[PDB]
């Protein structure tokens, strides 16, 4: 009869998922704002902002691959598009965000 321990696990599942989704909302908001800032400044001054942006993506990628939490499509698309972090991807994203791109798209 596994139900009593199963219920305990299920309650834990409900609570942790609730919490993760909330955290995801904060990542989403913070990223929308970094994208906005990056698009409003010059390339040199954007570098520490990109460092924060990619650091966040890296954590969201760890969530997806290490812990296997599959997030909403928006965050999934973000994890893909912003995975590559170098001079050449930064040049590309800076340009796109400066021209008014609000969230990473292809």
């Amino acid at each position: 009869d596994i139900w009593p321990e199963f219920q305990r696990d299920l309650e834990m599942y409900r609570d942790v998922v609730l919490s993760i989704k909330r955290n995801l909302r904060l990542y989403e908001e913070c990223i929308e704002s970094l994208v906005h800032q990056i698009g409003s400044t010059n390339f040199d001054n954007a570098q520490p902002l990109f460092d924060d942006l990619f650091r966040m993506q890296s954590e969201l990628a760890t969530m997806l691959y290490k812990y296997e939490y599959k997030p909403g499509k928006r965050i999934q698309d973000l994890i893909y598009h912003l995975d590559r972090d170098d001079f050449y991807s930064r040049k590309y994203w800076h340009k796109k965000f400066s021209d008014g791109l609000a969230w990473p798209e292809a």
Binding site: S58, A61, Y65, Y80, D83, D86, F87, Y88, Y92, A106
Partner: protein, 86 residues
């Protein structure tokens, strides 16, 4: 059989492939283990090969085995590798 992975302070190298120190460690740390195994799968999958869309010099985009990779066929460096977009 066993092929030693060499480390020169900057890169990990083996079988004509290489990864920067930090990128290599990042992949294991993030839950994407065995990056040489992943890259070899791409190279052996008859991959679709195109210029790097971002224009990094020497680099090409390879796609196969469920993954996309940015790779320099001259240096053997894998600059970036991840699963294809869902």
């Amino acid at each position: 059989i066993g092929k030693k992975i060499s480390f020169d302070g900057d890169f990990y190298t083996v079988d004509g492939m290489k990864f920067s120190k930090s990128y290599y460690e990042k992949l294991w740390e993030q839950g994407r283990p065995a990056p040489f195994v992943q890259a070899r799968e791409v190279l052996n999958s008859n991959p679709k090969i195109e210029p790097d869309p971002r224009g990094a010099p020497g680099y090409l985009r390879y796609e196969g085995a469920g993954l996309e990779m940015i790779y320099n066929p001259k240096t053997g460096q894998v600059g970036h590798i991840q699963p294809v977009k869902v």
